[PDB]
Amino acid sequence: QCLCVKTTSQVRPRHITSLEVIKAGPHCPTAQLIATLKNGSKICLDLQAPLYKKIIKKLLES
Amino acid sequence: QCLCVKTTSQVRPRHITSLEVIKAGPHCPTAQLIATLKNGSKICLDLQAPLYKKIIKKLLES
Amino acid sequence: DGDLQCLCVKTTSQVRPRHITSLEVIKAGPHCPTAQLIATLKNGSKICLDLQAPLYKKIIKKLLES
Amino acid sequence: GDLQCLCVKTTSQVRPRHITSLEVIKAGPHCPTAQLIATLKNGSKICLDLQAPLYKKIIKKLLES
């Protein structure tokens, strides 16, 4: 019953306010990357992708 | 899209630390009840009144 | 101790339940002696709601009825 | 602003294995600085320093599963 077990990512690094990295375990066998956007909505970044990278950095150089 | 498309009701209310209620938007047809547990986990809740009700009251009556 | 502290510092009563696009309910604990009601808005701003006010009951309904 | 920074203080050290969740919050009107919030297995949450070689060592232990 993963939180992030569906589509993954096509977002604008512009509107991400926070990025949460959740470890795999009980309810989810894989690591989930959830992203909170300005408008308050959430999304799942791709554990298996590059984009989530610059995203973190960006958030840290703010 | 959403993160919540496989909601659950198997959760123990004393183990919830916070509950996020996301308003239905374009990319997601329905409202979402994100529950974060004591161990940091996240799960999607069934949009059934008695549940989140009994929950928001245990969260707000700490 | 506690590296965390309450996110909320003051609550907004005069809020337009319309623009509220999300709501987070936080249980009390080490981080904060009281529970917290943080509502984000369509514009991206965030405000805290009063626990001794029905408004949140209202807002949560409006948010869950789609 | 109704909000302030959650991280009123930080911890320079703890074991990455204990971390179940790591939340990265970018600076804004709520807080003049970015924040690194880690949740541990026991349930506690700590704030970390923004010094790359540590959280990257944590972010890895988190995704290697």
Side-chain angles (χ1 to χ4, degrees):
Chain A
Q1 191 229 312
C2 284
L3 200 302
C4 283
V5 153
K6 231 211 295 194
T7 309
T8 308
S9 46
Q10 242 209 318
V11 270
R12 344 66 187 269
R14 223 189 190 186
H15 311 309
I16 172 183
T17 56
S18 68
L19 169 291
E20 168 161 33
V21 183
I22 302 183
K23 191 198 188 76
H27 303 70
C28 188
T30 182
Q32 310 119 94
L33 307 189
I34 305 160
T36 311
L37 280 45
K38 245 290 186 174
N39 42 305
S41 59
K42 301 248 180 298
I43 64 155
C44 290
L45 285 175
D46 222 310
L47 204 70
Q48 309 302 315
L51 126 73
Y52 83 71
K53 288 298 181 187
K54 290 298 175 183
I55 290 299
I56 281 183
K57 179 175 177 294
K58 183 70 173 184
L59 264 28
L60 250 38
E61 72 192 309
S62 60
Chain B
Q1 222 75 70
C2 323
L3 317 177
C4 295
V5 181
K6 172 42 192 164
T7 70
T8 184
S9 69
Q10 291 186 297
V11 66
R12 308 305 128 193
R14 62 192 157 96
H15 293 185
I16 289 176
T17 57
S18 59
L19 188 70
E20 203 172 322
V21 185
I22 311 74
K23 186 192 191 65
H27 309 66
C28 189
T30 193
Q32 315 186 71
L33 280 190
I34 310 290
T36 284
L37 292 27
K38 204 156 295 175
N39 52 54
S41 283
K42 276 171 157 66
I43 57 171
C44 292
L45 264 28
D46 282 349
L47 269 44
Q48 152 230 157
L51 175 62
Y52 72 66
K53 269 190 169 48
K54 119 104 77 296
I55 284 181
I56 296 170
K57 245 42 188 62
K58 197 166 194 308
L59 252 34
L60 239 47
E61 167 262 306
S62 51
Chain C
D1 202 304
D3 277 39
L4 291 293
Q5 79 178 331
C6 308
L7 210 176
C8 290
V9 59
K10 58 168 271 188
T11 61
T12 292
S13 60
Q14 239 125 177
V15 62
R16 47 241 71 140
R18 287 185 280 174
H19 309 59
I20 300 175
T21 184
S22 174
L23 187 69
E24 174 172 46
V25 186
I26 308 177
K27 189 186 186 175
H31 60 78
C32 189
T34 73
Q36 308 171 85
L37 256 310
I38 302 156
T40 303
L41 306 201
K42 203 174 198 170
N43 62 170
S45 56
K46 307 176 77 180
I47 59 154
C48 297
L49 312 174
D50 194 326
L51 278 45
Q52 255 59 68
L55 224 199
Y56 72 103
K57 282 269 176 288
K58 209 173 188 179
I59 304 169
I60 293 180
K61 189 186 89 78
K62 210 62 172 187
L63 291 175
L64 294 176
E65 299 175 306
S66 200
Chain D
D2 273 4
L3 301 62
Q4 71 177 332
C5 303
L6 208 74
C7 294
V8 78
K9 152 196 306 182
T10 67
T11 284
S12 50
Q13 54 176 296
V14 74
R15 288 167 164 282
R17 357 175 297 193
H18 297 294
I19 304 169
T20 65
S21 176
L22 182 79
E23 175 166 36
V24 190
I25 321 213
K26 94 175 297 179
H30 58 296
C31 192
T33 188
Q35 315 178 83
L36 259 312
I37 312 180
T39 307
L40 308 173
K41 304 186 172 181
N42 86 308
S44 65
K45 313 180 68 176
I46 60 183
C47 290
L48 313 187
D49 218 316
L50 315 191
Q51 18 165 284
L54 191 85
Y55 65 66
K56 265 206 298 173
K57 287 283 186 176
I58 294 179
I59 304 172
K60 71 162 187 179
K61 182 59 61 189
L62 290 181
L63 314 189
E64 295 195 315
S65 50

Short mmCIF file of all heavy atoms in Angstrom, two decimals, chain A residues 1-3 6-7 12 20 22 26-27 32 34 40-44, chain B residues 1-3 5-6 8 10 20 22 27 34 37 40-44:
data_model
loop_
_atom_site.label_atom_id
_atom_site.label_comp_id
_atom_site.label_asym_id
_atom_site.label_seq_id
_atom_site.Cartn_x
_atom_site.Cartn_y
_atom_site.Cartn_z
N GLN A 1 0.84 -1.23 0.00
CA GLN A 1 0.00 0.00 0.00
C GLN A 1 0.86 1.26 0.00
O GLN A 1 0.69 2.15 0.84
CB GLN A 1 -0.92 0.01 1.22
CG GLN A 1 -2.00 1.08 1.18
CD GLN A 1 -2.08 1.87 2.47
OE1 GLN A 1 -2.10 1.29 3.56
NE2 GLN A 1 -2.12 3.19 2.35
N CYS A 2 1.79 1.34 -0.95
CA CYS A 2 2.67 2.49 -1.05
C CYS A 2 1.90 3.78 -1.25
O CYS A 2 0.78 3.79 -1.74
CB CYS A 2 3.66 2.34 -2.21
SG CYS A 2 5.06 1.22 -1.95
N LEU A 3 2.54 4.88 -0.87
CA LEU A 3 1.97 6.20 -1.01
C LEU A 3 2.31 6.60 -2.44
O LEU A 3 1.50 7.19 -3.17
CB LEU A 3 2.66 7.14 -0.02
CG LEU A 3 2.00 8.45 0.41
CD1 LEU A 3 1.72 9.32 -0.80
CD2 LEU A 3 0.72 8.13 1.15
N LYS A 6 2.57 4.70 -8.32
CA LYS A 6 1.83 5.09 -9.52
C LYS A 6 2.73 5.99 -10.36
O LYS A 6 3.96 5.90 -10.27
CB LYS A 6 0.55 5.82 -9.14
CG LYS A 6 -0.68 5.25 -9.82
CD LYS A 6 -1.76 6.31 -10.11
CE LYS A 6 -2.38 6.93 -8.85
NZ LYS A 6 -3.67 7.70 -9.20
N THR A 7 2.13 6.85 -11.18
CA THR A 7 2.91 7.78 -12.03
C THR A 7 4.01 8.40 -11.18
O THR A 7 4.02 8.25 -9.95
CB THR A 7 2.02 8.94 -12.60
OG1 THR A 7 0.84 8.39 -13.22
CG2 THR A 7 2.81 9.74 -13.64
N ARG A 12 7.83 21.17 -12.30
CA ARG A 12 8.55 22.44 -12.38
C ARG A 12 9.27 22.73 -11.07
O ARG A 12 8.64 23.19 -10.11
CB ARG A 12 7.56 23.58 -12.63
CG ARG A 12 6.18 23.14 -13.12
CD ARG A 12 5.46 22.35 -12.03
NE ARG A 12 4.20 21.75 -12.46
CZ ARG A 12 3.01 22.33 -12.35
NH1 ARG A 12 2.92 23.55 -11.83
NH2 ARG A 12 1.92 21.70 -12.75
N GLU A 20 10.07 15.40 0.73
CA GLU A 20 10.23 14.45 1.81
C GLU A 20 10.68 13.08 1.32
O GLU A 20 10.08 12.50 0.42
CB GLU A 20 8.92 14.32 2.59
CG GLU A 20 8.87 13.14 3.55
CD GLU A 20 7.78 13.28 4.61
OE1 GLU A 20 6.72 13.87 4.29
OE2 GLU A 20 7.99 12.80 5.75
N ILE A 22 11.04 9.36 2.28
CA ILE A 22 10.55 8.34 3.20
C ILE A 22 11.19 6.99 2.91
O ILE A 22 11.17 6.52 1.78
CB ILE A 22 9.04 8.20 3.07
CG1 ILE A 22 8.38 9.54 3.35
CG2 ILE A 22 8.53 7.11 4.00
CD1 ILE A 22 6.89 9.48 3.32
N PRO A 26 7.30 -1.14 6.11
CA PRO A 26 5.97 -1.75 6.24
C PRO A 26 5.03 -1.51 5.06
O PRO A 26 5.01 -2.30 4.10
CB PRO A 26 5.44 -1.14 7.54
CG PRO A 26 6.68 -0.94 8.34
CD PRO A 26 7.62 -0.35 7.32
N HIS A 27 4.27 -0.42 5.12
CA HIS A 27 3.30 -0.07 4.08
C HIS A 27 3.85 0.12 2.67
O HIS A 27 3.09 0.16 1.70
CB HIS A 27 2.53 1.18 4.49
CG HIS A 27 1.83 1.06 5.80
ND1 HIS A 27 2.50 1.01 7.00
CD2 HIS A 27 0.51 0.98 6.10
CE1 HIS A 27 1.63 0.90 7.99
NE2 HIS A 27 0.41 0.87 7.47
N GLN A 32 9.88 6.27 -1.10
CA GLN A 32 8.97 7.19 -1.74
C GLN A 32 9.54 8.60 -1.65
O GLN A 32 10.17 8.95 -0.65
CB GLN A 32 7.60 7.14 -1.07
CG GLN A 32 7.05 5.74 -0.92
CD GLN A 32 6.82 5.33 0.54
OE1 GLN A 32 5.72 5.49 1.08
NE2 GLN A 32 7.87 4.81 1.19
N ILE A 34 8.14 12.26 -1.87
CA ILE A 34 6.94 13.06 -2.01
C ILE A 34 7.35 14.51 -2.06
O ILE A 34 8.23 14.94 -1.32
CB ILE A 34 5.99 12.83 -0.87
CG1 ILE A 34 5.70 11.33 -0.76
CG2 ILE A 34 4.73 13.66 -1.09
CD1 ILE A 34 5.17 10.91 0.57
N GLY A 40 -0.02 23.75 -2.52
CA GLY A 40 -0.40 22.81 -1.47
C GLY A 40 -0.54 21.36 -1.90
O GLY A 40 -0.69 20.47 -1.05
N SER A 41 -0.49 21.11 -3.20
CA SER A 41 -0.62 19.75 -3.73
C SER A 41 0.67 18.93 -3.53
O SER A 41 1.74 19.49 -3.25
CB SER A 41 -0.97 19.81 -5.22
OG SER A 41 0.02 20.51 -5.97
N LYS A 42 0.56 17.62 -3.66
CA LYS A 42 1.71 16.73 -3.49
C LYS A 42 1.95 15.91 -4.75
O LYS A 42 1.09 15.81 -5.62
CB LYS A 42 1.48 15.78 -2.31
CG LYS A 42 1.24 16.47 -0.97
CD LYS A 42 2.41 16.21 -0.03
CE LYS A 42 2.20 16.88 1.31
NZ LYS A 42 2.11 18.36 1.21
N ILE A 43 3.14 15.33 -4.85
CA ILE A 43 3.51 14.49 -5.98
C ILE A 43 4.61 13.53 -5.56
O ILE A 43 5.25 13.71 -4.52
CB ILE A 43 4.06 15.29 -7.16
CG1 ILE A 43 5.37 15.96 -6.75
CG2 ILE A 43 3.04 16.29 -7.64
CD1 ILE A 43 6.31 16.26 -7.90
N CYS A 44 4.84 12.53 -6.40
CA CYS A 44 5.86 11.54 -6.14
C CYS A 44 6.99 11.64 -7.15
O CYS A 44 6.78 11.37 -8.32
CB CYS A 44 5.25 10.16 -6.22
SG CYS A 44 4.11 9.78 -4.87
N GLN B 1 -0.73 13.05 -11.18
CA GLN B 1 -2.01 12.52 -10.64
C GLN B 1 -2.06 12.58 -9.10
O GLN B 1 -1.55 13.52 -8.49
CB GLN B 1 -2.21 11.08 -11.11
CG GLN B 1 -3.64 10.77 -11.54
CD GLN B 1 -3.98 11.37 -12.89
OE1 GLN B 1 -3.48 10.92 -13.92
NE2 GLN B 1 -4.83 12.40 -12.89
N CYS B 2 -2.68 11.57 -8.48
CA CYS B 2 -2.78 11.51 -7.02
C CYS B 2 -1.70 10.56 -6.49
O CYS B 2 -0.93 9.99 -7.26
CB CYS B 2 -4.13 10.96 -6.54
SG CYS B 2 -5.65 11.39 -7.44
N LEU B 3 -1.68 10.40 -5.17
CA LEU B 3 -0.74 9.52 -4.48
C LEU B 3 -1.68 8.52 -3.84
O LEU B 3 -1.34 7.36 -3.58
CB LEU B 3 0.00 10.29 -3.38
CG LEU B 3 0.52 11.70 -3.66
CD1 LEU B 3 1.13 12.26 -2.39
CD2 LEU B 3 1.55 11.67 -4.77
N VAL B 5 -4.81 6.50 -4.33
CA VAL B 5 -5.73 5.83 -5.26
C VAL B 5 -5.89 4.38 -4.79
O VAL B 5 -6.51 3.55 -5.46
CB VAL B 5 -5.24 5.92 -6.72
CG1 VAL B 5 -6.23 5.24 -7.66
CG2 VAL B 5 -5.14 7.37 -7.12
N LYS B 6 -5.31 4.12 -3.63
CA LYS B 6 -5.40 2.83 -2.95
C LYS B 6 -5.41 3.13 -1.44
O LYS B 6 -4.46 2.81 -0.71
CB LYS B 6 -4.22 1.91 -3.30
CG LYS B 6 -4.18 0.62 -2.45
CD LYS B 6 -5.58 0.00 -2.26
CE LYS B 6 -5.60 -1.10 -1.20
NZ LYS B 6 -7.01 -1.40 -0.78
N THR B 8 -6.59 3.14 2.63
CA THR B 8 -6.77 2.05 3.56
C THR B 8 -7.48 2.52 4.82
O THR B 8 -7.66 3.72 5.04
CB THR B 8 -5.43 1.42 3.95
OG1 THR B 8 -5.67 0.28 4.79
CG2 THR B 8 -4.55 2.43 4.67
N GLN B 10 -6.85 0.38 7.64
CA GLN B 10 -6.09 -0.38 8.63
C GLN B 10 -4.96 0.46 9.23
O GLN B 10 -3.81 0.46 8.77
CB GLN B 10 -5.54 -1.66 8.00
CG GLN B 10 -6.63 -2.64 7.67
CD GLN B 10 -6.08 -3.96 7.17
OE1 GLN B 10 -5.42 -4.01 6.13
NE2 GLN B 10 -6.33 -5.04 7.91
N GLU B 20 -3.15 15.22 6.92
CA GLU B 20 -3.22 16.25 5.91
C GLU B 20 -4.46 16.03 5.03
O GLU B 20 -4.64 14.95 4.47
CB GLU B 20 -1.96 16.21 5.05
CG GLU B 20 -1.62 17.50 4.35
CD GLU B 20 -0.26 17.47 3.68
OE1 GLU B 20 0.69 16.88 4.26
OE2 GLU B 20 -0.13 18.05 2.58
N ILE B 22 -6.08 17.19 1.75
CA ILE B 22 -5.87 17.88 0.48
C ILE B 22 -7.17 18.03 -0.30
O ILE B 22 -7.89 17.05 -0.53
CB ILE B 22 -4.89 17.12 -0.43
CG1 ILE B 22 -3.64 16.72 0.35
CG2 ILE B 22 -4.53 17.96 -1.62
CD1 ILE B 22 -3.87 15.58 1.31
N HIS B 27 -5.41 17.42 -11.37
CA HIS B 27 -4.66 16.18 -11.49
C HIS B 27 -5.18 15.06 -10.59
O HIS B 27 -4.87 13.88 -10.80
CB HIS B 27 -3.17 16.47 -11.25
CG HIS B 27 -2.65 17.61 -12.07
ND1 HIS B 27 -3.08 18.91 -11.90
CD2 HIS B 27 -1.77 17.64 -13.10
CE1 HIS B 27 -2.49 19.69 -12.79
NE2 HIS B 27 -1.69 18.94 -13.53
N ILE B 34 -4.07 12.19 4.00
CA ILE B 34 -2.71 11.70 4.21
C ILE B 34 -2.47 11.59 5.70
O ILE B 34 -2.58 12.58 6.42
CB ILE B 34 -1.65 12.67 3.66
CG1 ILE B 34 -1.99 13.08 2.22
CG2 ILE B 34 -0.26 12.04 3.78
CD1 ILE B 34 -1.82 11.99 1.19
N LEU B 37 2.29 8.52 10.48
CA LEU B 37 2.32 7.77 11.72
C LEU B 37 3.54 8.10 12.58
O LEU B 37 4.43 8.84 12.17
CB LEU B 37 2.22 6.28 11.38
CG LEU B 37 0.88 5.77 10.82
CD1 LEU B 37 0.11 6.85 10.07
CD2 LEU B 37 1.16 4.60 9.88
N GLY B 40 6.97 7.80 11.22
CA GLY B 40 7.25 8.58 10.02
C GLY B 40 6.57 8.15 8.74
O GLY B 40 6.62 8.87 7.75
N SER B 41 5.94 6.97 8.77
CA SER B 41 5.24 6.44 7.60
C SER B 41 4.05 7.30 7.16
O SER B 41 3.53 8.13 7.91
CB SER B 41 4.75 5.02 7.88
OG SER B 41 5.81 4.09 7.79
N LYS B 42 3.62 7.11 5.92
CA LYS B 42 2.49 7.85 5.42
C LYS B 42 1.57 6.88 4.75
O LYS B 42 2.01 5.89 4.17
CB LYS B 42 2.95 8.93 4.42
CG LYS B 42 3.40 10.24 5.07
CD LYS B 42 4.03 11.18 4.06
CE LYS B 42 3.98 12.65 4.53
NZ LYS B 42 4.81 12.94 5.73
N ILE B 43 0.27 7.15 4.85
CA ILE B 43 -0.74 6.30 4.24
C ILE B 43 -1.94 7.16 3.87
O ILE B 43 -2.14 8.24 4.42
CB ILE B 43 -1.21 5.20 5.21
CG1 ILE B 43 -1.75 5.84 6.49
CG2 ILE B 43 -0.07 4.25 5.51
CD1 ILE B 43 -2.43 4.88 7.40
N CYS B 44 -2.73 6.65 2.95
CA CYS B 44 -3.91 7.34 2.48
C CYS B 44 -5.12 6.76 3.18
O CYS B 44 -5.29 5.54 3.23
CB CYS B 44 -4.03 7.13 0.99
SG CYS B 44 -2.74 7.92 -0.01
#
